[PDB]
């Protein structure tokens, strides 16, 4: 066998196993790949860190969050840094069930000061500030995240949870591209989550259904807005499920 | 926005979020993708099922194994069938903590009779027969799996657990490509797992270390073979960790 053939076979294993949920085979292959003799700023850094990132993500997928974080201790790409902090955050929360929280906040603030604008890090800064009850800051980070990654649902959801009134909701929406379908979807979600649904929400929802006529998510939104106007029954689901928290 | 642009943006979200472990954003994007108007035998079937597979895998990654299985109820590619059965198997085991076990065995046997030779299904048949204590059958399926997918670690591990003597171990190894590095690695693992380590195991291990000199896995194997001849100390780790069961 050629070295490059072995590498390629391990890499194809990783892909086929991760697609099928076989996280232990992925972890083993990633360990072996990393054990071989070694063979714009961000993209280069991601290529350089690719093997070590694969190993850290395999641990993360086995729920080894401490080990994933430690694996990434030397890495510098924004992708690596995100997984490292998100690992630390989940490992701190596993153990709560958060000693790591202040640490994560400081790393994120240094990153901001340095001028990092990676949308996944901006999302974690958002989550951190919301949890510190710093809502104005949370909103400003999450808006910056969804401007860059408008199809990233979890940022829009955290944005909605950072917003405490329809007035604040209309202020934020006034700063987002009003034509963009995700802005429309967010508006519907956040109006319902605030329980302040007017006519515009129904209009926006009808627009989103033209593009996604059979979405389980939008069907739920429609059922919720229908209850708002006042087999499965949406009222008998856990509301955490209907709100997409679970 | 073009329809194809929206689709492409959702697909790029899925990739970037799944790489970072953001399973909830992936599930939302997969639901939306599947809600759009719709737009050798196996490869074709995988292309056809690709969207629905993405949705089922997103549920599987959120630990929604029943829902993943139900999502795949109409699918026919071997990849889809594997995830469906593996979901059912994990959902049956979650609930044990297995009503699904007999059902999975029957689907796998029909598949075998039909002449399916997908190595991931052959692995699940292996796991099923081993658990029925049908070791000869387990071995025959797992050998067929690793002949097709020799870098798939979990099949080699299940093969080792199906083997109860060095004599059976030497019978099986006599049927595998003796030159192939994974055969060598398996031999080392299975000899230690049997506690029947002779000189050949040390030889095979030394050969594997030429290619993977810094593998965490092989370092552990070396420490274990060293204990066999009789910072971290391998004797104080959980043996389930050292044996790669966890
Ligand atoms: Hg290969
Ligand atoms: Hg593989
Ligand atoms: Hg690194
Ligand atoms: Hg996009
Ligand atoms: Hg995205
Ligand atoms: Hg299907």
Swiss-Prot record, chains A, B:
Gene it is expressed from: cut23
Subunit structure, interactors included: The APC/C is composed of at least 13 subunits: apc1, apc2, nuc2, apc4, apc5, cut9, apc8, apc10, apc11, hcn1, apc13, apc14 and apc15.
Intervals holding TPR repeats: 49-82, 119-152, 216-239
Function comment: Component of the anaphase-promoting complex/cyclosome (APC/C), a cell cycle-regulated E3 ubiquitin-protein ligase complex that controls progression through mitosis and the G1 phase of the cell cycle. The APC/C is thought to confer substrate specificity and, in the presence of ubiquitin-conjugating E2 enzymes, it catalyzes the formation of protein-ubiquitin conjugates that are subsequently degraded by the 26S proteasome. Has a role in promoting metaphase to anaphase transition via the ubiquitination of specific mitotic substrates.
Top-rank lineage group of the source organism: Eukaryota
Name under which the protein is recorded: Anaphase-promoting complex subunit 8
